[PDB]
Amino acid sequence: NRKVEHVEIAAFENVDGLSSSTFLNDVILVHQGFPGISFSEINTKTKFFRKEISVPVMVTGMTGGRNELGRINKIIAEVAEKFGIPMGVGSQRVAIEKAEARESFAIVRKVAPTIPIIANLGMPQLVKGYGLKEFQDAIQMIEADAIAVHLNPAQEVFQPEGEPEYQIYALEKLRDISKELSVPIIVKESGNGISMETAKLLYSYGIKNFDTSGQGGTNWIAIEMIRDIRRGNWKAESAKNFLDWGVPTAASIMEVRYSVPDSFLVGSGGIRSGLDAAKAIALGADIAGMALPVLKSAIEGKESLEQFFRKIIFELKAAMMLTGSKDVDALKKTSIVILGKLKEWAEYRGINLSIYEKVRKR
Amino acid sequence: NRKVEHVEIAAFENVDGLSSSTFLNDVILVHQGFPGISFSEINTKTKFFRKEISVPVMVTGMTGGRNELGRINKIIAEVAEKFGIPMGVGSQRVAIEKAEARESFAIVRKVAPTIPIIANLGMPQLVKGYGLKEFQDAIQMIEADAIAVHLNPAQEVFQPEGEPEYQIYALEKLRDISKELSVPIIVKESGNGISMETAKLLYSYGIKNFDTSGQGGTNWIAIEMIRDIRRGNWKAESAKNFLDWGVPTAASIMEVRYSVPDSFLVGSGGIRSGLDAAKAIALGADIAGMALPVLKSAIEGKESLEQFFRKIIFELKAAMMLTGSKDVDALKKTSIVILGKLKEWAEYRGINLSIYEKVRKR
Amino acid sequence: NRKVEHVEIAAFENVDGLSSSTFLNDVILVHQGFPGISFSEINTKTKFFRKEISVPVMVTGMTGGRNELGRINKIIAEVAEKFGIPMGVGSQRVAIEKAEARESFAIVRKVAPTIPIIANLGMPQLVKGYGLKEFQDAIQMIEADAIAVHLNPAQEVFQPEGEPEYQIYALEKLRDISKELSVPIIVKESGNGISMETAKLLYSYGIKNFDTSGQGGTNWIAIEMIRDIRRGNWKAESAKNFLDWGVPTAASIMEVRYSVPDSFLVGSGGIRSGLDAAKAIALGADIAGMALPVLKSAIEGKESLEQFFRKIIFELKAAMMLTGSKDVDALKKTSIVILGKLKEWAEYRGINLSIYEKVRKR
Amino acid sequence: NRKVEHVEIAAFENVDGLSSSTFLNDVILVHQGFPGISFSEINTKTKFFRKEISVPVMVTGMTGGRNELGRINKIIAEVAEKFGIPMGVGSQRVAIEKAEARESFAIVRKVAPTIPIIANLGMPQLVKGYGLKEFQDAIQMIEADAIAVHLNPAQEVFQPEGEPEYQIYALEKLRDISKELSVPIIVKESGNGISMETAKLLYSYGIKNFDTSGQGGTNWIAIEMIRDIRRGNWKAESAKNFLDWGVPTAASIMEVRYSVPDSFLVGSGGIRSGLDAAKAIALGADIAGMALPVLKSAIEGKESLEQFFRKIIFELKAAMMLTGSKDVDALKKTSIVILGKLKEWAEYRGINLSIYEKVRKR
Ligand SMILES: C=C(CCOP(=O)(O)OP(=O)(O)O)[C@@H](CO)[C@@]12Nc3cc(C)c(C)cc3N(C[C@H](O)[C@H](O)[C@H](O)COP(=O)(O)O)C1=NC(=O)NC2=O
Ligand SMILES: C=C(CCOP(=O)(O)OP(=O)(O)O)[C@@H](CO)[C@@]12Nc3cc(C)c(C)cc3N(C[C@H](O)[C@H](O)[C@H](O)COP(=O)(O)O)C1=NC(=O)NC2=O
Ligand SMILES: C=C(CCOP(=O)(O)OP(=O)(O)O)[C@@H](CO)[C@@]12Nc3cc(C)c(C)cc3N(C[C@H](O)[C@H](O)[C@H](O)COP(=O)(O)O)C1=NC(=O)NC2=O
Ligand SMILES: C=C(CCOP(=O)(O)OP(=O)(O)O)[C@@H](CO)[C@@]12Nc3cc(C)c(C)cc3N(C[C@H](O)[C@H](O)[C@H](O)COP(=O)(O)O)C1=NC(=O)NC2=O
Ligand SMILES: [Mg+2]
């Protein structure tokens, strides 16, 4: 089973940042030796649609569809609830198809009654016949506060089974569906990043909420490579040539914030510390997303995951403290330096740095 | 025999990218998380002079002149025919001189009756007396659809036997010949690349078709170095100092497309994957060329070469799919980023990046 | 005891430049093959407030607070006096609180009657009740010629005990204090550097004297990381994520000189040779500071520390000789080159290099 | 004896390029696949003051002063005469002071009656009482066609014995002397390079002929470091800190040619192949100088040195052939690329690349 195999390869093989980069090493937060605040007044609260959350971080969707997967969703959800952190579940297709797969998603809401919970379906489902009703069912199954629709064409190109399909018709349908839905749609990538062209196209169809999921964290091309190697599939060697395919997370954050200045933006793909999260937010994200390190702690257990979030939160407040940022808003506006390849990326892409400074700050 | 030794050194020694670079690591194709197409509608067909080809890739000229060499030409040709891929043969000098060497070229047309076949003579033959008749004989011997005239002065400088000769008279003669020939001439390098000054000089004599053959692939200075080492020739240590001599393929593509915007352009030299080929094309080439990796697979056998092309084609379509490029024309216009040394090369050479963008996409 | 532990970790663990950089490798002094002077006329004297000092180098504050610490202060003070070099003592808070800790500071003046001596208290003390009287007591204890107020929020974030406090009220108080004090105030960092924003805020409260204490020297985040590891404190792994936090010394010198052109500036944090000292001054510092390498020599003994200063002074004169700088003033105006990351830092931070050149030369 | 030790350290210890760089890796000669010439027509002749020389390369001054040194001067001189190559002798101070040292210089003219021979005294001699008469004696001793006056302040700073003296009076005297001398003066560095400031100051005193001697070849600071280590002298560690002190040869060539456009320029310091020599000349030098590798071959024997010059000349013609440069003039004008640190050096130093292109081409 593909869902089990995915979790096992992500958690126990070497695919985190494999031959790829976030370009976050190119972003420096300027240290403020006179912060102007004290540690105890640092306020980490922010908005997440109609709800308030305790920390500008979310867990992005990963799993569900059978009981061992549901027990990972349970650990993640009950810890996220405790910490006031939003949580996306993984793809719900399996539970649209099979009633026994429902509980492994529903459990999330039982144990996390108050945080934002975000449903999940894949864009390809929209050209294979999914419509309003499947979306409402994904949403109602966990009383979702939003639904994420994922883009994973890279993964689909290199996986043994099948071929990606991304006709514009899917966007027409998406646009129709968003007018009848009572919760917002977020469009997220899954390891390879969102460019300006893709963010503007999505915007022209009514999409305002993005999750970057850039290269440099979980490498889904590497994951499929490993599944190909395991079955002696021919594609393995081709996947290896594409290991560094994608938009780096930090470049993707800049590209979505610049091309759609009023977007609500999750910066994710390789966020591994509260310092990475602070960088993502100062660059222009509204919140930082994480998947893989949450998975690996959850598999270790509830208390491991509690420790993990304590660490992320401390690191984030440390960066806020050391930049003079009393709250999330001030963090979005703090002083940064951009160097090296990220800077060359932006310049070639016509990202005028002065208008960038202005846009990331309002 | 030099032809045999050449093939043996290229195939079995360490001379592929030896101390050299294509600069293709400096070209990035911008990933499109919503491609807007489906994998099965990707069309790879393109024009090659008066014929249509199935994939925008060619095999560039390598060998011929005796029976063991002819059997390599046979394998390559019958596989290229099967895949709808054009094929250049190696230098036909030896078959102009000796009737017995003819069959080792002619076999290409016997087993490949439909694809473009490209004949081959060296530029120095033009100052050693070759004229119209030798060109017509090269062409007729394989019913060629075109003839390539090669520039290899770097190789000639370091080889033990003789000295390069490139007087302008050769171009006058080339110019005369091209008005009496019923097929087009392509001018190609052989490892060291074509600059703007050389492309403009060639153009001023009526040459419109170029094949970059840049540094970063097969290193012909290294091949000669090794021939020198083998014979204890003094020049070996001098060849070693020139290992990184030449214009990197990526820079050569930019230089030719910029200095001659209506050229028909083969991007070649170090093309090892369908992703290299995609980059070569997006940069400004009309098609990608390959020699060495085709040689090494052909030596292994028919089925090894068939598998090799399946892999190149898949990698190419993967890059087209992940950039939203439904056909070769879309690929020539797709978004890219250029960074690092390639970017510094272009700036010092006066290649205004904005006018470059415009020129590479019409 | 924290003071003892600090000295032992700084002196005997690996924390000097740990994962951090001064960016001084990006500063090059232009060699002058015809210096225009002779070695023996080189004059290293310069002003330090109302006194004249023999060398434009100071020892910045480190220790004090018990007898073994006082014996280190004594060695450093008596050598500094012999060389005509100013000396800052470490934080005097402990001697405000406990009369027995006083002698370990006062010994500095007994043994060094003429050189400038610089008192020390931490900025957080100002929001914890310290004011005029404690400042006058720190000064009188050693008949100080100045008092340094230190910023160490990074160190405080990562240390096991407590939390940093840097409300603006501290600056209000500092500003009132400075009007009743009879010696100047210097504000220094302690390993993480001073930015333009912090220098400007400090300036707007009447502070004119700065000591950069940039990253790339003693890494106080690493020191607290090590104290955390030793106690099995959870923060250790978070400290490790921040090892390269802060403004590099060279960038901090540029930022302070640019944002406050008339400041009196100590360039410190990783000054390890007379060449680093020459670099700091040519970049815009008025004098170079050192802490750690003086400590390590002092622990070895009086004669070890004498040899250390002889080496620093020789290296500084060598750099003056090789740039044609007859005095400290000529050195501040000598030709330099700025390359690589320091150059990209300055550009992103809006430090126009031409106005920089003008400002650092006046 | 210092002369013997210097030769032994340079020839047999690791001091060539030690921790230093020429920046010539940053200069690329553009390859021309159609050279437009043939190898046998390449002409390497050029002027050297009033004489003609066969190759635009010289041996810069090294040794003399006793019989074993004289025998090295004899091998180098007789080979240079055979090849049509100018030769500078090392410092003649010892032969001004002691009549027995004379023959070890004079032998150069006996064995090389036609090529330019360049006499040698140090700049500090001019403030130590040398004047016209000592200059005429240096010149007459070998019937010199020119005299080189060397700048070696870096070497003097770090050597155990003494101190450097470069008062302006030396230039006043030099300026007087050049008006009574019947041959030209060349001012050369010796490992640390010539800047714009130094070139302009020299020029204002009537100096028109320069030899860059930049960092990246023989490292005179390292040589003195090694002499210090051997005697347990304290300066050793200080010398180690200055190993990368100086203007890289490539940068010095650009600085002298830009700041003094009509100068006659020897580009030297780390020239190790005829490709380095071609780079030096294309950058703006009129000729390339070499010292160290000539010494090492001469110590091996007459036939070793003859083979060395054959290698250098072949490499130089190869680079001329591969750039379409039929003569030394065309080479000075051929297409280049400048990248990386050399490019950043030039930009910070105000060397406008477009006016540079113009100036190096006349
Ligand atoms: C398996 C998935 C469903 C689609 O595949 P399919 O089998 O076709 O599905 P159907 O047929 O059932 O429709 C993935 C999609 O890649 C997915 N599951 C899932 C598994 C694991 C185990 C980890 C680790 C990450 C994902 N991520 C990306 C994750 O949310 C992050 O954006 C990236 O990992 C980057 O963040 P870091 O670097 O890790 O911090 C998921 N993203 C999705 O939106 N939905 C998911 O379910
Ligand atoms: C022998 C040749 C020319 C004549 O030499 P000579 O003995 O004086 O001949 P005469 O005229 O005197 O009879 C070579 C090129 O030197 C040549 N054969 C030849 C063999 C091998 C075995 C490989 C490997 C590649 C060449 N290539 C370059 C190839 O087409 C590609 O451009 C480059 O290899 C770059 O692409 P990659 O990086 O590899 O993907 C050929 N190019 C040609 O134009 N002509 C040829 O016949
Ligand atoms: C560690 C300290 C104690 C802080 O106070 P606390 O523990 O809260 O105690 P209370 O306030 O409660 O009393 C610091 C204060 O930051 C400090 N002591 C002190 C000890 C050691 C042993 C070395 C090595 C460096 C400091 N430095 C930085 C030094 O002056 C240099 O700026 C930097 O080291 C950078 O320069 P290099 O790279 O090394 O050349 C000092 N700086 C201060 O201004 N005062 C000090 O006392
Ligand atoms: C010892 C010297 C004289 C001054 O010393 P001193 O004891 O004060 O003398 P007095 O007091 O008696 O006057 C040197 C100067 O370093 C010198 N001898 C000398 C020896 C050898 C053994 C090598 C190797 C190089 C020199 N070169 C540098 C050479 O010409 C090149 O510029 C550099 O080597 C750079 O080019 P590459 O990288 O090698 O290709 C010479 N330069 C001079 O102008 N004159 C010399 O005599
Ligand atoms: Mg799928």
Ligand SMILES: [Mg+2]
């Ligand atoms: Mg040939």
Ligand SMILES: [Mg+2]
């Ligand atoms: Mg404290």
Ligand SMILES: [Mg+2]
């Ligand atoms: Mg001398």
